[PDB]
Amino acid sequence: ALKDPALLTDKAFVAGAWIGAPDGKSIAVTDPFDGALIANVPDLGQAVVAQAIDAAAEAQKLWERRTAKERAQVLKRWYDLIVENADDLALILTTEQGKPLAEARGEVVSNAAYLEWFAEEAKRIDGDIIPGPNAGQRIMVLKQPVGVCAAITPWNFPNGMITRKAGPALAAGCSMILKPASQTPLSALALAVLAERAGVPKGVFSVVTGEAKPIGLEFCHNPRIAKITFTGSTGVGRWLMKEAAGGIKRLSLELGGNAPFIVFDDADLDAAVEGAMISKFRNAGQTCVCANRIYVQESVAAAFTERLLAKVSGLSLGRGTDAGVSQGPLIDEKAVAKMEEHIADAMANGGTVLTGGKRSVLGGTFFEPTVVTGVTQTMKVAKEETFAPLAPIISFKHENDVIAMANDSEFGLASYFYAKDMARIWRVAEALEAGMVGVNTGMIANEMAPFGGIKQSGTGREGSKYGIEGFLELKYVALGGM
Amino acid sequence: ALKDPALLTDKAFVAGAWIGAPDGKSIAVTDPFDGALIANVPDLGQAVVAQAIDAAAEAQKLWERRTAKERAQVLKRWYDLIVENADDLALILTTEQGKPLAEARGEVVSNAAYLEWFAEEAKRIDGDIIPGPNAGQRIMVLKQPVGVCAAITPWNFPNGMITRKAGPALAAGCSMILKPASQTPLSALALAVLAERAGVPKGVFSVVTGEAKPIGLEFCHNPRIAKITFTGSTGVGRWLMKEAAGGIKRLSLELGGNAPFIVFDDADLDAAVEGAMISKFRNAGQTCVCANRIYVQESVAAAFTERLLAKVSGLSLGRGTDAGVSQGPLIDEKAVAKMEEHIADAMANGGTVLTGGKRSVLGGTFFEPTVVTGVTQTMKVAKEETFAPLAPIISFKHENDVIAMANDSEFGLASYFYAKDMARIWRVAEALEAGMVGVNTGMIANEMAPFGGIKQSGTGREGSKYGIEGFLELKYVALGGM
Amino acid sequence: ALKDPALLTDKAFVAGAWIGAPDGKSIAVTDPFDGALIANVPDLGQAVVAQAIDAAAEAQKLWERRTAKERAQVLKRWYDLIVENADDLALILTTEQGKPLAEARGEVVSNAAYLEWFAEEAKRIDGDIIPGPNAGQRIMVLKQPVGVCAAITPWNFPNGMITRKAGPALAAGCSMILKPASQTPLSALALAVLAERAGVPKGVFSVVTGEAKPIGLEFCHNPRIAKITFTGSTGVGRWLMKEAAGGIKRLSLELGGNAPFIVFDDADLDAAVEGAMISKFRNAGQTCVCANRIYVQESVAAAFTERLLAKVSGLSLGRGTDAGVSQGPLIDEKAVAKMEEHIADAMANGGTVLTGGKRSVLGGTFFEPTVVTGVTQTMKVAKEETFAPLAPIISFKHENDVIAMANDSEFGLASYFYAKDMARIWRVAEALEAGMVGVNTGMIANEMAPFGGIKQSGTGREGSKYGIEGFLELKYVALGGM
Amino acid sequence: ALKDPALLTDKAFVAGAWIGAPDGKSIAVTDPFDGALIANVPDLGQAVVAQAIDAAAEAQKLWERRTAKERAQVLKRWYDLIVENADDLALILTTEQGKPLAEARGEVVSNAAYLEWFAEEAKRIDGDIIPGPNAGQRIMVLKQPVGVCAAITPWNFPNGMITRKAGPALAAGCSMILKPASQTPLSALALAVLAERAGVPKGVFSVVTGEAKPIGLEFCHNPRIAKITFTGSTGVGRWLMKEAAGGIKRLSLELGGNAPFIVFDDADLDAAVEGAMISKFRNAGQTCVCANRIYVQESVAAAFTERLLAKVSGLSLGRGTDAGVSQGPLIDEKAVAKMEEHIADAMANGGTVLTGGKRSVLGGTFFEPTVVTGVTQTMKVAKEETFAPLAPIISFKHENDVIAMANDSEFGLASYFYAKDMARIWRVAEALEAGMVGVNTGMIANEMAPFGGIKQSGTGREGSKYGIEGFLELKYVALGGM
Ligand SMILES: NC(=O)C1=CN([C@@H]2O[C@H](COP(=O)(O)OP(=O)(O)OC[C@H]3O[C@@H](n4cnc5c(N)ncnc54)[C@H](O)[C@@H]3O)[C@@H](O)[C@H]2O)C=CC1
Ligand SMILES: NC(=O)C1=CN([C@@H]2O[C@H](COP(=O)(O)OP(=O)(O)OC[C@H]3O[C@@H](n4cnc5c(N)ncnc54)[C@H](O)[C@@H]3O)[C@@H](O)[C@H]2O)C=CC1
């Protein structure tokens, strides 16, 4: 039911052309709601990926010579086409990933914003004129594109993560070759159709599908891949960083987080409950910024949990294309197993399930939104990310205790807390060890802000004025003989 | 013969205290000129290094809470003490490394400049106030110290590389634990004496000596080491990056380069010869920015080589503390063997040794400055770094040919060319694939410029306004409930 | 012959509504080619302007509260509408001002670029987070809109000067009330129609026509006018600055210049002649950046003047809407009188008219493009701006002599020189006393560059990242009690 | 009683030499405590000032050619000499102006900080490399010194205002000629002695004394004066801006303010009283940032006024060189008359004097610190600046009412308020119409912050990264022929 059926394609985008696997191999794409088959995308080997990388290298050589105005115009055309076809893209995203159609459309728009922002940033790549060491010399600092970039995106955001990687790379003058997740490769191919329609030159943007490990090896071992941007799990990031060591490749990583959610006694309780609802249960808890631990002060915990239960009662599961549906199915059975393991550990270690705690009657990978009280810091959920709709509530008594507990983790992606006092807000926001802190709000996604984490959560930033730094290399030129 | 004998020490600096190895093990330091023994520094194991890292962590916790003015004042005091004791530091450096005393003093001053610059930068770590997405929210971007940093420095610059790593780390509010090269550990310990005298708090600066591999493993595997800065060979950098993968550690690497030196027919020949003399033969060719290939256009090559031979005839070898001595001994016998191998390959492959080509009559590790004509692109020196005073001269005919030849390498550290036309200068400087380009000058060292390389030559920059970026982490704070 | 006849209007834009003079008074607009009447715009008194300023104040209060995204979207819509209707706008501009239709269209597009650039800049108004003086205090630096801005534009660019004033003002969140030149008020009103169509809120943009002096007095004496941007002659700028003194109003002025054009013996002669043709004879010499003195070295002067005469022979006068017409009529008879006076002074003082030197056979205000050799520094044209198509050629012998002669003026707007040597280019470009220097090019208009002059040529800049600074005020907030 | 008697001088500093008036005319300097004569400084006419301006022009020509490192080193030497001689400078300042010796020393140190900061900024004057419009052109933006600057300083801070004007001017490469207030010219001459001792070249720094109006006329009418920085009253600023109009001179003005002081019901009352004590009664209320109106919410006013009276009881008047003295005499009898007029208007219009209200028993220009309750918005003090130690207390009931009352003034220099809620702090700080806002603190002086006002309080900023912008001019260079 697509207004533009060309946005659904069964071929990979290599050297600006639509190709299939030369051995006929393919990977099926299935709808998570009922397992229905969608299409067979090509399964590309290492040789086709090598040819794609060579094409991307030539295209990058031709693409860095264009003016910043031309590249910005191409990126703006791509953004306009993405916003124009947002309904078809949202339908494809909901079909492949399973999130509610409203969430899919919100993702498409709020992440085409990244393409718009970096189209603006393409014209602001400014060098420097540094004072010289003597009268006979001047100093220029030029910023130049690093080269061919390789992007690896997860199933978590089939469209959202692609724009925030392709935008800065293209704006800087770099070429991109993207390997999307095999579970949800259709959003990438639709964006490739739009990019070709937008005037992106042949080879500058490429989407390759296939077995993840061989393509990652080709990305890590090809000398013509200057930079690799990766979003995904911590283990695959560590594997990539180990494999890219032999070539000294620039690596930008966004890995998992364990986001605390603190509610102080001087907070707005209704605002705190709304923020917890949007931070935890968005994408059915499958978001890298999703809250994973909810800390409440002892004097407020009862009222917070009462309002939270009242709000969780209103959640409705079902198919994403169904009106009134807030929660879609988990990505696969492993997510259900992990969520069950976390709930079982919570129950055994002393916690109490207040709501949910079992698979929903819909069957498949659907799960009831679970609210559990009495969680402690020894529990599995206290140190591990569920990626599923579970709301563990830990109680505290003092600000420094919750600061000690919230930083008791190796992941530094996101954190949230609710308070009114300015001194407390500044103190807690500076003390929390995270890349991003949301104060009195559960929504932090922004193409103008430096999205990214610290510690094991990865390196580099996405969006803002710092998002293009990783794709550029400095060149210090000393002009003598004046 | 030291004005301040306390600048020569036989102990490592751990937790702000002077300690020795608890097992009595030690590493001897010898003078490269005649093998004379200087002192026995401690050989520290992994447990002492672990305790040092813990102390550095506590010190960093206390040191990031100080105001930027206090940290800048401490760094400025350290710079003042370094400049005041420049003669003793230069004598220690010449004794341990072998470079001429004038070069040692120049190194000490021109690299204390880094400490001064980053003392100034400590007070300019500014956040951002980004426009909000709606009236109810504001956006702050804070910059915070990454944590405990570990520095590994080579024998190449026993003092120079330490200031440009300790300055930005301390200015950002990070703590440093440094492992200097075992060949030349005395400059680091002298700087540690001065740092303690300058008011650096206990644990903020640490110097540890011992076997390189166990300390590097401890640096890579300790969770309390947030960042690792390394300067050295490409192989050790690759080993470090592979070993740091399991912890997702921020890695800044300055690795080797293969610097071309181009002389066009529209160049100032006397200036070109002076630039080649300072770029190639400084530190007896043992510099990461030293020229390694000298390209000359066909119509200028004869006059350039005649003037170059006239200038090389004036070079004088001997002990560093001897007046009129321009060249000191190579670091060890491996450097002599590599230089001999390069000369032999040049002779066998068709090249002609015009001057030098053998060890000097002084014996030991001294080598005659060698000028060889007829070098080609298949020669070992054309793709490998000698780190020794050899001047290979390759001839070309056209600008694009020399651009193809100069970029025919995996190392992107430095490059030099001599030309007068503005269009040619801009075109060649933009086409050359290097981190740093010196136009009409063989001297590019500058604490105000972004020192660093591209491709395999490493990641990150030293000095300038970009030198402190690697030691800071961004924190995006979204302040809701307005 | 307008595709959209609503772009031609006979009413002023006040409080977001189209109004006429309440006393029936009006100002006629006539076509400079043959004096044909176009329309009668209102002649507004000081009371109507006062009401307009009050409306602009209320609108600014409502308009600074909108998000930067909304204001950028409005500005981008305005830019899109301007580019879409570029042909009708160009026809109106050619009818009112007289420039060739191709030049009018080029003006419309290349100055809507300013609106696009400042729409991008609207989202990049970033504050600062400065390190505090102690642990108990933080420092924010906010940037806020200055308030209601008043713009005064000349007949020189009926459309070009309006976008580069309205863009930054609206992007910053300021409101604008513009008084265009009485000779060419129709382009401003057409842009007002488009702005209303683009969603600019009522009062944020206002166009008022009438007697210049009373409206300027109202602008200078109204306390609700925070800032005044003026483009025009030096005398009116001095009058405005004297009249705005009593209120301490922020004043940005772009006044006249006396642009030198130097041709060195190492220059590209064909490029120099093309640059002189575009710099001097564009807009029939009626441009603030137009070359006014052409200096040539003694060894190149003959060939330069021969090629220049060959190129001037190809100029064709006539109506702007006529194919092949390069030169339109001067604005009025005063321009013809001034050009005749300059030619007469040149002839009497020793110079020789090589080409032109009299009114063309077309009659009216048309003038033959004049090339005069033998000009000296005592001549009237050497120190005064003709604003008419005369090419005075002064010869020199040395670089320092031409540097002394080119800086022998109180105006610092623009300068041009042609040379190839990098050292000479840097030296002369740094020595020339001008806001803008065009090296080897006669075209410098750019919305990404800081357009503006020094000395008597005015204060402030237009375009680039510095163009929005004048419309914002800093606010240093010190947050204590941490 | 000076450790260095050369810091007290009776001559003006012109062309780097110490001169007297060629007609023997002089101006006496008297101690405000008892009228005791100190020294006779020269009274310089317009011809000597013209010669000084010519010398400053030549010196600026020689001084902009020095490297940024050399100028920064000179400025740092000047700062070091100022801090070393802080006691003699403080004694001179207390003798000439009358403020307590502790305040004089604090002024000397905290304003030599400006010299240090701008010495650091001298090396950070960076140009830009903007992306070109096509492949054949590049764009540089250079920052160059504006030229010769003229500074006019008040008696308010005999030393404080001089460093924050001379630092940025010298760092940018501009020359300064300063005319200090005739009441307190000795601090300027002492700083000139130190500047000569610090290696400031002849003519770069000049101090001229004499009749204010002729020297101001010479500053405004000399074509070689590029920029004028003025600190003082609004009327003299308006006169200067009117007189500088004929030459289109860059004018930076810091004029008077009417600073509100708001205490909300959610504030820390002890902190509010301490902040009011330091903001109001510092320099006996003779400060441009001194609080002038104290607003208190109705529910807190009684306790605030009780604590304020308890703190005002502890103030001690007398000679500045006396231990335990907090308040010195007013500058002259006009200040006493104005303070008496304000107190009389407060008493007549309904207000009640709670403490003080008359001249102290010490006689002369001493005045008792006065606290008056019941002040309204019609009172003279509500719209006029006393510059004397009077604490008018106005009561309010709601936040928007106090926002309306605080902005009910044409002066936008400083404001203070005390609150704890983050939303209230952000809202009020953004709503207040002032250049500087001090939240929960009465101290805002900082060389790293943009000191300056809005509206009639003046234009431009002092300190921070924006303090050097006014002394530099942009130069857009377009390099064609690539
Ligand atoms: N924080 C984040 O952004 C993400 C977190 N996750 C984490 O991952 C778990 C499940 O997701 P996964 O499928 O494991 O994610 P993943 O990290 O394995 O998948 C992300 C991307 O990596 C690629 N990839 C996987 N193995 C690879 C290999 N050996 N070589 C090269 N590329 C390879 C995949 O094709 C995909 O494009 C979740 O429970 C959560 O912990 C899930 C998705 C993204
Ligand atoms: N470009 C540069 O900055 C440098 C280049 N070189 C290269 O290295 C060659 C000889 O120098 P090398 O002694 O090989 O340099 P290197 O890279 O091995 O030594 C640099 C530092 O690395 C440390 N290190 C060495 N092995 C380590 C290990 N396994 N784990 C942890 N740390 C370790 C050393 O203690 C020293 O502090 C030269 O021929 C040249 O190619 C030499 C010195 C520095």
Residue numbers in the entry:
A (entry chain A), B (entry chain C), C (entry chain D), D (entry chain B): 8 to 489
What do the study authors state?
Oxidation of SLA is catalyzed by SLA dehydrogenases belonging to the aldehyde dehydrogenase superfamily. SLA dehydrogenases (annotated as GabD or SlaB) belong to the sequence-based protein family PF00171 within the Pfam database, which are members of the aldehyde dehydrogenase superfamily. We report that SLA dehydrogenase RlGabD from the sulfoglycolytic bacterium Rhizobium leguminsarum SRDI565 can use both NAD+ and NADP+ as cofactor to oxidize SLA, and indicatively operates through a rapid equilibrium ordered mechanism. SLADH enzymes catalyze the oxidation of SLA to SL, the final step of sulfoglycolytic pathways that lead to excretion of SL,4 and the second step in the oxidation of DHPS to SL in Desulfovibrio sp.,5 which activates this substrate for sulfur–carbon bond scission in the DHPS degradation pathway to produce sulfite and pyruvate.
Thus, cryo-EM grids were optimised and prepared with 1 mg mL−1RlGabD pre-incubated with 2 mM NADH. The RlGabD tetramer assembles as a pair of dimers. Each L-shaped protomer comprises an α/β N-terminal cofactor binding domain [residues 8–133, 153–263], an α/β catalytic domain containing the conserved Cys-Glu dyad [residues 264–476], and a smaller, anti-parallel β-sheet oligomerization domain [residues 134–152, 477–489], which interacts with two other subunits. The RlGabD dimer is formed through domain swapping interactions of the three-stranded oligomerization domain of subunit A with the catalytic domain of partner subunit (B) forming a ten-stranded β-sheet. However, this still allowed NADH to be modelled with confidence, and showed that NADH is bound in an extended mode, as seen in E. coli SSADH GabD,23 with the nicotinamide group protruding into the active site located in the cleft between the two major domains. The nicotinamide ring sits in close vicinity to the catalytic dyad, and the adenine ring occupies a hydrophobic pocket lined by Ala 219, Leu224, Val243, Trp246, and Leu247. The RlGabD·NADH complex displays the catalytically-relevant ‘in’ conformation with the nicotinamide ring pointing into the active site, and C4 of nicotinamide approx. 6.7 Å from catalytic Cys295. Thus, we propose that Cys295 is the catalytic nucleophile, Glu261 is the general base, and the oxyanion hole is formed from Asn163 and the backbone NH of Cys295.
